[PDB]
């Protein structure tokens, strides 16, 4: 509530891009989960090179950050998954080449300070991400559903 | 189930005086309810098993109320288990008044449990002029002979009850809160039994032509008629005995007798 | 009676979210109890009379639970009174989603009350393999034709329910706590009706020789078979529609179909 | 009478460990004495009536000794009273090991009391080679069939005893002083029953010509023969189970078997 | 860590039973989950009337407590479930009669103060509890596995 206004102020001073702000916003300090509507806006605006390359790079870095920042890891995987389904053609083409790199994100163990396995939530969400990318045919089917579905409405 | 059992524990406790009547309701309401009808009677098995005759004395005054008011299913509950209160045979207590009274009082209630074995249907609470709800005045001739003979065994036990006590009751042998508490249900039942039998006769003589079994009536009436004299003396002596003069403690028996014998023999 | 009514007032109140399930128990327990069974239904008459469709919306989700679990006597309660929820005909509300849904939803429940008029006996909760407690698979041939035809009218109403809403459900026309609360009992019943009919057929083909009424079976099965395709599309579309993926919200229908048609026609 | 009762009170007290064997003598001597033979058994009625299963557990180990040694009149004492230890039906205790064991153990001893109802004469202590003092090997053919069939019911109860405990005994479910105390008399009797039956057969085959009832022998032997395999496994498992390796805790069963079957069928 | 020692001190002063202490211990203030070994000890010592009736009564009351106490609700359901499988015969017999009462614990909605649905974890765990109790035959099969399994070892 209060920490959100401070976080946003720091972003404006540094002058981050529109994508980096939304990513940082998703990785919020509060306990409340990220909204699904926010994932749609990111998916639609994930075509450009200047935006897409930054999105993939930031979310990958969000997985580590530090020991305390555990919320920043779980929120990153949620955004990445949706960018594959309703994202764009450029998203899939890049992920296909970088599939060899993304594949190794399953055994992510971590311990902050006290002694609570925060990577349990991370491991589960990441497991689903690797399962979808492992099947090439499944990815192709998802593309057709999102492309035709978008054309059906407009 | 759990909350209802707590009401029994508080009400049926060792507090000398009689329990709160309002508290008894919540316990004795859960019987028409077809939810379980078990948890109430579960606690009424391990407690009579105890040797003490203080808590047990007050325990047997609630059952006497529920048996004269509740559904006949409540009577059916303690039939599948043959054992009831037979463990109280051969016991020893402080005063002579205690054991001498308990030994017979414990068997009087056993007969009430045995009452359901034969008649089954509810008897003590089916009005005086009714056919549908009553299952005595319009029963099968085989059942009619059985339901009356069963009531006789219960009615004669009242004389047997006062036999071991002698004279009638004796306030000297009944001068505690627990003892006087169990006297009221015994009397209320005694007058009840006397009422529901003679009330049947009022409907029996009316319905003679619309029946089939004249032979199995005169022996039932004749045996019951002789009990009147025994019952008259029971309360006549009780009236002389110093006790609380309540309507439920000393009802008036002589009401139906001269206009019952003459009208019944005409049919024969 | 008074204390039980207070539980209804607290539970069924205007608090947006669904009520406490534990509180509902104490209200919906008092039905097998043969003490009165009236005070509970008294408050469920003056409240539907109101014009507002906010408290009324949450009022009709409790009745949907008690009708699928409680004794069939509860269904018999609101039969002697012909009027139920007909006053909601011709109404006007804020959003278009409200009135468009209410006008048909109110009549869907009326059919459920009319279900007891013909079949009477409890249907939605008599196991899948049982003869004694079930009164459907071993009913009279006259009753058997009636109990199935009644279920058809209720089952077909599900298609009629989605007709006025179009497509299937539409989350846009169902995006409040009160609306999503009433969706679960509708689905649980829908799968229940589908289950208890096809379960009867599993026992029907087994008991063909020990029966008398082969002519009044094929028309019942044939009409019910065509409803499968209508029901498959109902949930297939619902699965696509964004909603809570609970077992009670989207059960799996295709289980009994190819090994039912062939085995039934042999008898004919 | 009074002084003898005091010995019972001190010996049969709550002291965890087993009582003094010397003290038991003075109590169990007063039985052949034809002075009264009542005061001893009077105290063994009000104490089992209690609900606690701690003092009762040690109470039932003395009776098991007196029944295997004393005069058969001692067995006849608790026959005129039909009730013995039936009040322990439906009980609840601390650990699961307690109630699970008590419910069956209490009925095992009831059978021992029922043993006198049929056979009457003393069985467990009449030597192996004797005619005058023994009333089994030289009984009436009618009594001979009855006395063996009664022993079968007692012998089969040993298998039933271990059934509710499963496996055999389990030290984990028998790790107290009171529990291990009652194990020895059960085993001593088990081997005793096995001994006195097979000992009869040793005299039975010898006395075939001087008898009248060959038909009522083969069924008795055949049924008893099959019990050997059940009894062998009983102690074979017990040997594996960690327990005190005393002669009275694990006797050796296989001694008479191959030279018993063949010699008996020749007569038939 | 520190609040645990204080909680235990309050229990000793009041003088609660052995069962009530273990139940309160399961419903700890810390974020760490309850151990599975602790559930075994409760299951073995759930035969006696004086213990069993208290266990069922306390755990049922733990489901409400207050708005803030959300951890006390989730831990209660974990204990109840294990008391059915490896508990005792008396546990099942009582649950059979009280099945009519236990059944209505599925739609348990709750909101503490800020605005976080704490009943989401409660609803999931309770759903599994009702599913197991709904099948009478399944309960009978579980009994045989625990009884025979215990006899196999000792």
Swiss-Prot record, chains A, E:
Cellular localisation: Cytoplasm; Membrane
Domain ENTH span(s) in chain numbering: 11-143
Family, similarity comment: Belongs to the epsin family.
Function: Binds to membranes enriched in phosphatidylinositol 3,5-bisphosphate (PtdIns(3,5)P2) and phosphatidylinositol 4,5-bisphosphate (PtdIns(4,5)P2). Required for endocytosis and localization of actin. Negatively regulated via phosphorylation.
Subunit structure and binding partners: Interacts with EDE1 and PAN1.
Protein name: Epsin-1
Gene: ENT1
Span of the entire protein shown here: 1 to 154 of 454
Swiss-Prot record, chains B, C, D:
Single annotated GO MF: phosphatidylinositol-3,5-bisphosphate binding
Lineage: Eukaryota, Fungi, Dikarya, Ascomycota, Saccharomycotina
Residue ranges annotated for the ENTH domain, each copy included: 1-123
Biological role stated in the UniProt entry: Required for cellular morphogenesis and polarization of the cortical cytoskeleton. It might act in concert with proteins such as CDC42 and CDC43 to limit the region of cortical patch formation to the cortex of the bud. Required for the accumulation and/or maintenance of plasma membrane H(+)-ATPase on the cell surface.
Name of this chain's protein: Protein SLA2
Full protein: residues contained: 5 to 272 of 968
Highest taxon of the lineage: Eukaryota
Gene: SLA2
Main location: membrane
Keywords: Actin-binding, Cell membrane, Cytoplasm, Cytoskeleton, Membrane, Phosphoprotein, Transmembrane, Transmembrane helix
CC annotations in GO: actin cortical patch; cellular bud neck; cellular bud tip; clathrin-coated vesicle; cortical actin cytoskeleton; incipient cellular bud site; mating projection tip; plasma membrane
């Amino acid at each position: 509530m209060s920490k959100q206004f401070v976080r946003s102020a720091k972003n404006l001073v540094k002058g981050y891009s529109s994508t980096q702000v939304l990513v940082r916003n998703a990785t919020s300090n509060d306990n409340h989960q990220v909204s699904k509507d926010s994932l749609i806006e990111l998916a639609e605006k994930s075509y450009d090179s200047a935006d897409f390359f930054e999105i993939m790079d930031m979310l990958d870095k969000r997985l580590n950050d530090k020991g305390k920042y555990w919320r920043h890891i779980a929120k990153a995987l949620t955004v990445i998954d949706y960018l594959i389904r309703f994202g764009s053609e450029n998203c899939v083409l890049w992920c296909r080449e970088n599939l060899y790199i993304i594949k190794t994100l399953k055994e992510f163990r971590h311990e902050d300070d006290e002694g609570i396995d925060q990577g349990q939530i991370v491991r589960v969400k990441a497991k689903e991400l690797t399962a979808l990318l492992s099947d090439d045919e499944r990815l192709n089917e998802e593309r057709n559903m999102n492309i035709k579905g978008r054309n059906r409405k407009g | 189930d759990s909350d209802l059992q707590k009401a029994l524990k508080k009400a049926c406790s060792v507090e000398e005086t009689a329990p709160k009547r309002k508290h008894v309701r919540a316990c004795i309401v859960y019987t028409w309810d077809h939810q379980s009808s078990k948890a109430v009677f579960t606690t009424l098995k391990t407690l009579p098993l105890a040797n003490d005759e203080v808590q047990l004395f007050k325990m047997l005054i609630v059952l006497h109320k529920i048996i004269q008011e509740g559904h006949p299913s409540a009577l059916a509950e303690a039939i599948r288990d043959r054992d009831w209160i037979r463990s109280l045979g051969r016991v020893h207590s402080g005063g002579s008044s205690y054991s001498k009274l308990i030994r017979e009082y414990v068997r009087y209630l056993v007969l009430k449990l045995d009452f359901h074995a034969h008649h089954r249907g509810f008897n003590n609470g089916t009005f005086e002029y009714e056919e549908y709800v009553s299952l005595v005045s319009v029963s099968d001739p085989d059942e009619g002979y059985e339901t009356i003979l069963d009531l006789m065994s219960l009615q004669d036990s009242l004389d047997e009850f006062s036999q071991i006590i002698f004279a009638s009751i004796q306030s000297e042998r009944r001068n505690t809160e627990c003892k006087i508490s169990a006297l009221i249900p015994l009397i209320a039942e005694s007058y009840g039994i006397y009422k529901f039998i003679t009330s049947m006769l009022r409907a029996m003589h009316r319905q003679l032509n619309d029946a089939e079994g004249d032979a199995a009536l005169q022996p039932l009436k004749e045996r019951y008629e002789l009990q009147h004299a025994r019952l008259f003396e029971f309360y006549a002596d009780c009236s002389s005995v110093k006790y609380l003069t309540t309507l439920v403690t000393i009802p008036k028996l002589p009401v139906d007798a001269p206009d019952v014998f003459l009208i019944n023999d005409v049919d024969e």
